[PDB]
């Protein structure tokens, strides 16, 4: 029966309610209506007339058969219409006229086999047209079908087997157009069909013959080409031969995910000389060949989900100009070796996450010579043994992420000491030993620290602690650390913070003393053990911008009267208000503190 007010008088959700009409409940002011899984066999001028200001209308799977004339005449601001999954029988010529700038039409899985079915009258402002999972076999558009502003044209999972020059000429009016053919079994492409410079990006996912495709794309300029395959797709084998057609074209970015390389030689990459990004995800690789020469101008390489044994097997020598290197999700113990990326002088991003890495004297030799590195991600790995000055050899580092990778640091070592430009550090669930005061020494300028999921002596943060060594912090996350208390003078020395997360601990109102010297922060104290908030430190809360006190056993006796009038007065400033409710007394248990 009832819709949900997702945003004040402007967005509503009515999904799965089986409604046969728009409710009188829904107001004039509605702009976003999610109406999926209702029952509108026929749609007409009368159907949506009450809701004159719609911007986004989703009618997915509403069993619509008929979209009658002038349905949207009174809907000038309609931007997106979503008709996915309706068994459409007929759409009137003027059924979509009305909106002054209709920019997105979804006709996915609506049974369309003849593109003449789509009413052209008011489509000249279309930016995207979604025709996937229909019964289509030719991308040839009808004559006098507007294509000028068309920027995305999705043809997935259809029955397109051939693409001709005639077919593609249809789209000549477009500029920077991107087409998706994923899940069509393309048996041939007339060569030169994509000579037109208007084509930005193409996807031919799951295609069973790349030779055919490349030959078709001869003399063409593309930003990117997605030629990845899937588990379920039938078994092929790529060869050097396969890519012969590639050096008679130009593409910045290629994806060859999940493929199997028959006889991988350095000769296999003969035609990759102008490629800037290569993705060989889950390509069954145990290494790369040495001395390629044909990835001389690569900037981005993705080797995720492969099966390397030693890092040096990627033969980094091949790609000196490399900027970003991803080896996430390696499927067996990856040995980082030493000086293995030494040749990659200009590297800026390095992702080694989830690759089951067990370093032990880290990381100056493993990361030798990586002078320009800015982002390093070693998260979700087995334990690291971090040297004192662990990252000397990666000095200009900016964002370091080791979440969920247990750090072994022998006190009083400072592993981060040289990381003078590091602005974001994530040590979540790293099982630190917070007892070491010098653990963050040298990080005087860091702006964002995440110490989520770590422990403290006695479950308490004292006057003296490791955080007065990262004096600049703006964002500080101390959630889910089992804190029972924070000392009064624990955050003095941090005179910059504007985001403090103390949620999911067992802190109480007297811990709010530690915040008295701060102003206008986002303060998240959700899921704690706050009951009474003493009034003398009530102005500590009022000094801030946004507060979250939700999921606390808050007290609703007269002993907490001052806090209850404060909360009502400042309702606007309070985040997650709906879930902020009384524990005591029993009569008021569950009552929203409003």
């Amino acid at each position: 029966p009832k819709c949900t007010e997702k945003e004040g008088n402007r967005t509503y959700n009515c999904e799965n309610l089986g409604l046969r009409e728009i409710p009188d409940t829904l107001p004039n002011t509605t702009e976003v209506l999610e109406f999926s899984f209702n029952f509108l066999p026929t749609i007409q001028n009368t159907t949506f007339s009450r809701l004159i200001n719609l911007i986004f209308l989703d009618l997915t799977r509403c069993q619509i058969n008929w979209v009658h004339e002038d349905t949207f005449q009174s809907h000038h601001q309609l931007n997106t219409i979503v008709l996915t999954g309706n068994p459409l029988i007929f759409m009137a010529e003027t059924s979509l006229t009305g909106p002054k700038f209709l920019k997105h039409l979804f006709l996915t899985q609506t049974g369309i086999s003849n593109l003449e079915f789509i009413p052209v009258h008011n489509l000249e402002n279309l930016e995207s047209l979604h025709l996937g999972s229909n019964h289509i076999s030719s991308i040839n558009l009808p004559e006098n079908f507007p294509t000028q502003n068309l920027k995305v044209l999705d043809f997935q999972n259809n029955a397109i087997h051939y693409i001709s020059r005639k077919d593609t000429n249809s789209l000549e009016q477009a500029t920077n157009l991107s087409l998706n053919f994923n899940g069509n079994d393309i048996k041939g492409i007339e060569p030169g069909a994509f000579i037109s410079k208007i084509f930005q990006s193409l996807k031919f996912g799951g295609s069973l013959n790349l030779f055919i495709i490349f030959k078709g794309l001869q003399n063409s300029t593309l930003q990117s080409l997605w030629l990845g395959t899937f588990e379920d797709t039938d078994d092929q084998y790529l060869t050097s031969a396969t890519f012969e057609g590639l050096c008679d074209m130009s593409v910045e970015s290629i994806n060859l995910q999940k493929h199997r390389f028959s006889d991988l030689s350095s000769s296999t990459f003969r035609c990759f000389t102008r490629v800037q990004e290569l993705d060989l995800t889950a390509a069954h690789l145990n290494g790369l060949p040495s001395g390629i020469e044909g990835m001389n101008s690569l900037k981005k390489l993705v080797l995720n989900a492969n099966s390397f044994d030693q890092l040096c097997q990627i033969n980094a020598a091949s790609f000196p100009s490399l900027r970003d290197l991803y080896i996430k999700g390696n499927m067996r113990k990856l040995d980082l070796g030493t000086r293995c990326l030494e040749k990659l002088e200009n590297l800026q991003k390095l992702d080694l996450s989830h690759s089951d890495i067990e370093a032990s004297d880290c990381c100056n030799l493993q990361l030798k010579n990586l002078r320009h590195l800015q982002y390093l991600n070693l998260s979700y790995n087995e334990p690291l043994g971090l040297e004192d000055q662990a990252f000397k050899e990666c000095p200009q580092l900016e964002l370091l992420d080791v979440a969920f990778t247990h750090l072994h640091v022998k006190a009083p070592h400072s592993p981060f000491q040289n990381l003078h430009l590091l602005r974001v550090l994530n040590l979540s669930h790293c099982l630190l030993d917070t007892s070491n005061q010098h653990l963050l020494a040298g990080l005087q300028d860091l702006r964002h620290l995440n110490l989520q999921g770590n422990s403290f002596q006695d479950g308490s943060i004292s006057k003296t602690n490791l955080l007065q060594m990262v004096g600049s912090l703006e964002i500080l996350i101390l959630s889910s650390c089992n804190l029972l208390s924070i000392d009064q003078q624990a955050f003095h020395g941090l005179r910059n913070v504007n985001h403090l997360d103390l949620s999911h601990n067992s802190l109480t109102g007297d811990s709010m003393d530690a915040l008295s010297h701060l102003k206008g922060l986002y303060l998240n104290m959700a899921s704690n053990n706050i009951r009474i908030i003493p009034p003398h430190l009530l102005p500590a809360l009022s000094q801030q911008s946004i507060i979250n006190l939700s999921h606390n056993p808050l007290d609703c006796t007269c002993s907490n009267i001052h806090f209850i009038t404060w909360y009502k007065e400042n309702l606007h400033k309070l985040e997650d208000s709906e879930e902020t409710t009384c524990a005591n007394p029993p009569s008021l248990r569950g009552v929203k503190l409003s």
Binding site: Q44, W66, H68, E69, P87, I89, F90, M91, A92, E93, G111, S113, N114, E116, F117
Partner: protein, 136 residues
């Protein structure tokens, strides 16, 4: 009763129709609306079949001021001559046809007229029924 749809509207000319099959509506439109109807005109049609149409016939009756004028019958599909690709489709199949019919050219004298069109099979079962109005 079923709603009255607009088959087309050029100028002062317009053709309206409404389905006289009690069981269902259907979708129809003509592409060029002109006094001078060219031969081999193109139509658009959307319907779910409730009868097999290996054999399919059209009856047309034309009316003016309630009195009648011309009656004829033409076969669309016959066992020994399916004229259209959709001939021999089964009961229960959904159809969308966008293509030519093979009409000779003819004018339509000016005047408000009601045309009654009926598609039926060999057992006289209704496949489709339109009560149409042509307005000059």
């Amino acid at each position: 009763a079923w709603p009255t749809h607009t088959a087309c509207r050029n100028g002062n000319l317009q053709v309206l129709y409404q389905s006289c099959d009690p069981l269902q509506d259907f979708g129809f439109s003509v592409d060029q609306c002109a006094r001078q109807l060219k031969p081999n005109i193109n139509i658009r049609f959307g319907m779910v079949l409730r009868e097999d149409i290996e054999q399919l016939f059209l009856d047309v009756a034309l009316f003016s001021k309630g009195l009648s004028i011309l009656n004829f019958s033409y076969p669309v599909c016959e066992v020994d001559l399916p004229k259209f690709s959709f001939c021999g489709r089964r009961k229960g199949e959904q159809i969308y046809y966008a293509g030519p019919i093979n009409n000779p050219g003819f004018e339509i004298p000016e005047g408000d007229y009601q045309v009654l069109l009926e598609l039926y099979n060999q057992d006289h079962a209704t496949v489709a029924c339109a009560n149409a109005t042509v307005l000059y």
